Amino acid sequence: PQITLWKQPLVTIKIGGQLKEALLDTGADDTVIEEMSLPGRWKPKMIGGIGGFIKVRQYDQIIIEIAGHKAIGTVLVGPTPVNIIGRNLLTQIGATLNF
Amino acid sequence: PQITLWKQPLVTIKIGGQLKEALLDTGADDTVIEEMSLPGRWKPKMIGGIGGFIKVRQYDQIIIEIAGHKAIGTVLVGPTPVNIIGRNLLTQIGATLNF
Ligand SMILES: COc1ccc(S(=O)(=O)N(CC(C)C)C[C@@H](O)[C@H](Cc2ccccc2)NC(=O)O[C@H]2CO[C@H]3O[C@@H]4OCC[C@@H]4[C@H]32)cc1
């Protein structure tokens, strides 16, 4: 699709058997989801933005379906105020910014 | 142009006659720029990101060029980790997300 930016570009995602709403975020290197369980090993990470850093769990090789399009990559899980789909998965669904 | 997301979507902006680098950020409602001097009066705003909140100065109707495209609108100035062009100005330059 073509998504305009008059309002937040929120989409439905499927991750870990769950549906969630998430923001398509070109300013995010990484994908960050609110607390949930994921399979496999993880390792700790600090990620930071406006207001500082938060501690997250890094899970690799997670399959996500984003607005209908499947992708695999790393997902960070922790106390983010907004589920954000970052560039590591935006690339995989072929998303671009056009103007 | 068409901007892919394999690398950060950094562009050159011009504000106050000066060139700066900034991130095109569809996950940002507002444009936030590192400390600089802007003309006129400002109003207070608190903005909230991943790691909590920062206080910024809101300047309205500021002339800014983004990747060669002219915009005039609200710029927030404060202790942001990077210069962010948010949706208030992405919509002025006609940006969309496409996949
Ligand atoms: C109302 O107006 C606003 C309100 C909030 C924000 S924001 O900067 O907090 N943010 C909102 C979003 C979290 C809901 C915009 C994001 O695009 C920021 C934009 C951002 C970029 C860099 C640093 C600070 C902020 N990105 C971000 O937090 O990315 C995280 C995840 O991946 C990592 O990549 C980034 O680069 C490495 C660190 C960050 C990490 C901007 C304008």
PDB file of N, CA, C and O in Angstrom, chain B residues 10-52:
ATOM      1  N   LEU B  10      18.936   9.529   6.515  1.00  0.00           N
ATOM      2  CA  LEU B  10      19.530  10.816   6.853  1.00  0.00           C
ATOM      3  C   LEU B  10      19.528  11.711   5.629  1.00  0.00           C
ATOM      4  O   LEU B  10      19.865  11.243   4.530  1.00  0.00           O
ATOM      5  N   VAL B  11      19.150  12.966   5.854  1.00  0.00           N
ATOM      6  CA  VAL B  11      19.151  13.949   4.788  1.00  0.00           C
ATOM      7  C   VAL B  11      19.740  15.241   5.356  1.00  0.00           C
ATOM      8  O   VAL B  11      19.857  15.400   6.575  1.00  0.00           O
ATOM      9  N   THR B  12      20.090  16.130   4.427  1.00  0.00           N
ATOM     10  CA  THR B  12      20.521  17.471   4.822  1.00  0.00           C
ATOM     11  C   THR B  12      19.301  18.386   4.889  1.00  0.00           C
ATOM     12  O   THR B  12      18.448  18.335   3.989  1.00  0.00           O
ATOM     13  N   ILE B  13      19.247  19.144   5.973  1.00  0.00           N
ATOM     14  CA  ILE B  13      18.234  20.177   6.146  1.00  0.00           C
ATOM     15  C   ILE B  13      18.945  21.517   6.212  1.00  0.00           C
ATOM     16  O   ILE B  13      20.143  21.584   6.498  1.00  0.00           O
ATOM     17  N   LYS B  14      18.172  22.580   5.993  1.00  0.00           N
ATOM     18  CA  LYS B  14      18.682  23.926   6.155  1.00  0.00           C
ATOM     19  C   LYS B  14      17.701  24.684   7.071  1.00  0.00           C
ATOM     20  O   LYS B  14      16.520  24.777   6.766  1.00  0.00           O
ATOM     21  N   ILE B  15      18.248  25.200   8.170  1.00  0.00           N
ATOM     22  CA  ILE B  15      17.458  25.949   9.129  1.00  0.00           C
ATOM     23  C   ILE B  15      18.344  27.067   9.624  1.00  0.00           C
ATOM     24  O   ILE B  15      19.518  26.866   9.914  1.00  0.00           O
ATOM     25  N   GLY B  16      17.808  28.298   9.700  1.00  0.00           N
ATOM     26  CA  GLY B  16      18.645  29.389  10.146  1.00  0.00           C
ATOM     27  C   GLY B  16      19.847  29.671   9.256  1.00  0.00           C
ATOM     28  O   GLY B  16      20.840  30.208   9.761  1.00  0.00           O
ATOM     29  N   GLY B  17      19.775  29.329   7.969  1.00  0.00           N
ATOM     30  CA  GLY B  17      20.862  29.496   7.027  1.00  0.00           C
ATOM     31  C   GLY B  17      21.966  28.467   7.189  1.00  0.00           C
ATOM     32  O   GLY B  17      23.006  28.536   6.511  1.00  0.00           O
ATOM     33  N   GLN B  18      21.761  27.487   8.083  1.00  0.00           N
ATOM     34  CA  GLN B  18      22.761  26.496   8.352  1.00  0.00           C
ATOM     35  C   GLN B  18      22.328  25.115   7.897  1.00  0.00           C
ATOM     36  O   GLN B  18      21.168  24.763   8.052  1.00  0.00           O
ATOM     37  N   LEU B  19      23.305  24.364   7.407  1.00  0.00           N
ATOM     38  CA  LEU B  19      23.027  22.978   7.064  1.00  0.00           C
ATOM     39  C   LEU B  19      23.270  22.049   8.246  1.00  0.00           C
ATOM     40  O   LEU B  19      24.239  22.191   8.958  1.00  0.00           O
ATOM     41  N   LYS B  20      22.359  21.103   8.428  1.00  0.00           N
ATOM     42  CA  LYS B  20      22.427  20.079   9.439  1.00  0.00           C
ATOM     43  C   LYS B  20      21.976  18.753   8.864  1.00  0.00           C
ATOM     44  O   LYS B  20      21.268  18.720   7.854  1.00  0.00           O
ATOM     45  N   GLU B  21      22.337  17.669   9.506  1.00  0.00           N
ATOM     46  CA  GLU B  21      21.810  16.358   9.113  1.00  0.00           C
ATOM     47  C   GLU B  21      20.684  15.983  10.077  1.00  0.00           C
ATOM     48  O   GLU B  21      20.708  16.291  11.277  1.00  0.00           O
ATOM     49  N   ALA B  22      19.683  15.353   9.446  1.00  0.00           N
ATOM     50  CA  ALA B  22      18.470  14.958  10.191  1.00  0.00           C
ATOM     51  C   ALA B  22      17.912  13.662   9.631  1.00  0.00           C
ATOM     52  O   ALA B  22      18.077  13.289   8.476  1.00  0.00           O
ATOM     53  N   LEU B  23      17.212  12.965  10.496  1.00  0.00           N
ATOM     54  CA  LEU B  23      16.611  11.662  10.211  1.00  0.00           C
ATOM     55  C   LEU B  23      15.142  11.826   9.836  1.00  0.00           C
ATOM     56  O   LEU B  23      14.348  12.427  10.566  1.00  0.00           O
ATOM     57  N   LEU B  24      14.798  11.313   8.659  1.00  0.00           N
ATOM     58  CA  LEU B  24      13.394  11.260   8.290  1.00  0.00           C
ATOM     59  C   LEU B  24      12.736  10.226   9.176  1.00  0.00           C
ATOM     60  O   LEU B  24      13.157   9.069   9.119  1.00  0.00           O
ATOM     61  N   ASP B  25      11.734  10.607   9.948  1.00  0.00           N
ATOM     62  CA  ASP B  25      11.230   9.726  10.986  1.00  0.00           C
ATOM     63  C   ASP B  25       9.729   9.625  11.031  1.00  0.00           C
ATOM     64  O   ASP B  25       9.038  10.453  11.613  1.00  0.00           O
ATOM     65  N   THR B  26       9.196   8.573  10.402  1.00  0.00           N
ATOM     66  CA  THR B  26       7.762   8.396  10.343  1.00  0.00           C
ATOM     67  C   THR B  26       7.172   8.053  11.704  1.00  0.00           C
ATOM     68  O   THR B  26       5.945   8.162  11.898  1.00  0.00           O
ATOM     69  N   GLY B  27       7.984   7.657  12.670  1.00  0.00           N
ATOM     70  CA  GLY B  27       7.561   7.357  14.021  1.00  0.00           C
ATOM     71  C   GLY B  27       7.508   8.533  14.968  1.00  0.00           C
ATOM     72  O   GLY B  27       7.146   8.402  16.122  1.00  0.00           O
ATOM     73  N   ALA B  28       7.875   9.712  14.474  1.00  0.00           N
ATOM     74  CA  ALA B  28       7.872  10.954  15.186  1.00  0.00           C
ATOM     75  C   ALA B  28       6.716  11.842  14.730  1.00  0.00           C
ATOM     76  O   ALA B  28       6.609  12.173  13.560  1.00  0.00           O
ATOM     77  N   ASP B  29       5.810  12.246  15.626  1.00  0.00           N
ATOM     78  CA  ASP B  29       4.737  13.150  15.273  1.00  0.00           C
ATOM     79  C   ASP B  29       5.298  14.530  14.922  1.00  0.00           C
ATOM     80  O   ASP B  29       4.792  15.210  14.036  1.00  0.00           O
ATOM     81  N   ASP B  30       6.327  14.904  15.683  1.00  0.00           N
ATOM     82  CA  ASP B  30       6.877  16.246  15.631  1.00  0.00           C
ATOM     83  C   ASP B  30       8.338  16.256  15.216  1.00  0.00           C
ATOM     84  O   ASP B  30       9.031  15.241  15.339  1.00  0.00           O
ATOM     85  N   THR B  31       8.804  17.387  14.764  1.00  0.00           N
ATOM     86  CA  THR B  31      10.209  17.646  14.383  1.00  0.00           C
ATOM     87  C   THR B  31      10.959  18.178  15.585  1.00  0.00           C
ATOM     88  O   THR B  31      10.525  19.159  16.203  1.00  0.00           O
ATOM     89  N   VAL B  32      12.084  17.533  15.908  1.00  0.00           N
ATOM     90  CA  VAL B  32      12.870  17.906  17.071  1.00  0.00           C
ATOM     91  C   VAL B  32      14.324  18.065  16.652  1.00  0.00           C
ATOM     92  O   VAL B  32      14.891  17.153  16.054  1.00  0.00           O
ATOM     93  N   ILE B  33      14.901  19.219  16.966  1.00  0.00           N
ATOM     94  CA  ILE B  33      16.249  19.579  16.540  1.00  0.00           C
ATOM     95  C   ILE B  33      17.108  19.892  17.753  1.00  0.00           C
ATOM     96  O   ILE B  33      16.595  20.439  18.732  1.00  0.00           O
ATOM     97  N   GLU B  34      18.382  19.572  17.704  1.00  0.00           N
ATOM     98  CA  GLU B  34      19.328  19.858  18.767  1.00  0.00           C
ATOM     99  C   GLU B  34      19.403  21.356  19.025  1.00  0.00           C
ATOM    100  O   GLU B  34      19.018  22.138  18.167  1.00  0.00           O
ATOM    101  N   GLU B  35      19.896  21.676  20.213  1.00  0.00           N
ATOM    102  CA  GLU B  35      19.965  23.062  20.645  1.00  0.00           C
ATOM    103  C   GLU B  35      20.546  23.968  19.572  1.00  0.00           C
ATOM    104  O   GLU B  35      21.594  23.746  18.988  1.00  0.00           O
ATOM    105  N   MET B  36      19.844  25.020  19.273  1.00  0.00           N
ATOM    106  CA  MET B  36      20.229  26.068  18.366  1.00  0.00           C
ATOM    107  C   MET B  36      19.334  27.275  18.679  1.00  0.00           C
ATOM    108  O   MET B  36      18.391  27.248  19.452  1.00  0.00           O
ATOM    109  N   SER B  37      19.717  28.372  18.030  1.00  0.00           N
ATOM    110  CA  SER B  37      18.980  29.588  18.227  1.00  0.00           C
ATOM    111  C   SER B  37      18.022  29.787  17.060  1.00  0.00           C
ATOM    112  O   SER B  37      18.375  29.674  15.902  1.00  0.00           O
ATOM    113  N   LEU B  38      16.788  30.067  17.432  1.00  0.00           N
ATOM    114  CA  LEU B  38      15.733  30.370  16.489  1.00  0.00           C
ATOM    115  C   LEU B  38      15.073  31.685  16.868  1.00  0.00           C
ATOM    116  O   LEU B  38      15.086  32.038  18.054  1.00  0.00           O
ATOM    117  N   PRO B  39      14.475  32.375  15.912  1.00  0.00           N
ATOM    118  CA  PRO B  39      13.875  33.662  16.222  1.00  0.00           C
ATOM    119  C   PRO B  39      12.485  33.531  16.807  1.00  0.00           C
ATOM    120  O   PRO B  39      11.785  32.548  16.600  1.00  0.00           O
ATOM    121  N   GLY B  40      12.085  34.566  17.536  1.00  0.00           N
ATOM    122  CA  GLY B  40      10.746  34.713  18.049  1.00  0.00           C
ATOM    123  C   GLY B  40      10.520  34.123  19.421  1.00  0.00           C
ATOM    124  O   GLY B  40      11.396  33.665  20.144  1.00  0.00           O
ATOM    125  N   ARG B  41       9.236  34.127  19.783  1.00  0.00           N
ATOM    126  CA  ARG B  41       8.870  33.531  21.052  1.00  0.00           C
ATOM    127  C   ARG B  41       8.701  32.024  20.956  1.00  0.00           C
ATOM    128  O   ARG B  41       8.341  31.528  19.899  1.00  0.00           O
ATOM    129  N   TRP B  42       8.871  31.331  22.069  1.00  0.00           N
ATOM    130  CA  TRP B  42       8.606  29.901  22.099  1.00  0.00           C
ATOM    131  C   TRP B  42       7.590  29.552  23.188  1.00  0.00           C
ATOM    132  O   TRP B  42       7.363  30.378  24.072  1.00  0.00           O
ATOM    133  N   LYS B  43       7.038  28.353  23.067  1.00  0.00           N
ATOM    134  CA  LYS B  43       6.087  27.794  24.033  1.00  0.00           C
ATOM    135  C   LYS B  43       6.591  26.446  24.516  1.00  0.00           C
ATOM    136  O   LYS B  43       7.379  25.761  23.850  1.00  0.00           O
ATOM    137  N   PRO B  44       6.211  26.040  25.700  1.00  0.00           N
ATOM    138  CA  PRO B  44       6.778  24.823  26.253  1.00  0.00           C
ATOM    139  C   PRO B  44       6.081  23.579  25.720  1.00  0.00           C
ATOM    140  O   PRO B  44       4.870  23.588  25.459  1.00  0.00           O
ATOM    141  N   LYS B  45       6.871  22.523  25.551  1.00  0.00           N
ATOM    142  CA  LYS B  45       6.294  21.235  25.230  1.00  0.00           C
ATOM    143  C   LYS B  45       7.118  20.152  25.904  1.00  0.00           C
ATOM    144  O   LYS B  45       8.326  20.257  26.039  1.00  0.00           O
ATOM    145  N   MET B  46       6.447  19.106  26.322  1.00  0.00           N
ATOM    146  CA  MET B  46       7.104  17.906  26.824  1.00  0.00           C
ATOM    147  C   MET B  46       6.792  16.792  25.840  1.00  0.00           C
ATOM    148  O   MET B  46       5.613  16.618  25.539  1.00  0.00           O
ATOM    149  N   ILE B  47       7.864  16.140  25.383  1.00  0.00           N
ATOM    150  CA  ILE B  47       7.694  15.077  24.396  1.00  0.00           C
ATOM    151  C   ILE B  47       8.375  13.826  24.932  1.00  0.00           C
ATOM    152  O   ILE B  47       9.407  13.836  25.614  1.00  0.00           O
ATOM    153  N   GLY B  48       7.698  12.748  24.544  1.00  0.00           N
ATOM    154  CA  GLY B  48       7.886  11.440  25.047  1.00  0.00           C
ATOM    155  C   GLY B  48       8.345  10.383  24.096  1.00  0.00           C
ATOM    156  O   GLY B  48       7.763   9.963  23.100  1.00  0.00           O
ATOM    157  N   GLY B  49       9.534   9.864  24.436  1.00  0.00           N
ATOM    158  CA  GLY B  49      10.033   8.879  23.518  1.00  0.00           C
ATOM    159  C   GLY B  49      10.244   7.583  24.264  1.00  0.00           C
ATOM    160  O   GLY B  49       9.637   7.292  25.293  1.00  0.00           O
ATOM    161  N   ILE B  50      11.164   6.829  23.686  1.00  0.00           N
ATOM    162  CA  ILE B  50      11.353   5.482  24.201  1.00  0.00           C
ATOM    163  C   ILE B  50      11.791   5.488  25.650  1.00  0.00           C
ATOM    164  O   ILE B  50      11.303   4.651  26.412  1.00  0.00           O
ATOM    165  N   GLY B  51      12.649   6.406  26.092  1.00  0.00           N
ATOM    166  CA  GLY B  51      13.292   6.306  27.398  1.00  0.00           C
ATOM    167  C   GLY B  51      12.846   7.333  28.414  1.00  0.00           C
ATOM    168  O   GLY B  51      13.506   7.612  29.420  1.00  0.00           O
ATOM    169  N   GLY B  52      11.692   7.896  28.127  1.00  0.00           N
ATOM    170  CA  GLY B  52      11.032   8.888  28.964  1.00  0.00           C
ATOM    171  C   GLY B  52      10.874  10.183  28.177  1.00  0.00           C
ATOM    172  O   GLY B  52      10.769  10.121  26.950  1.00  0.00           O
TER     173      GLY B  52
END
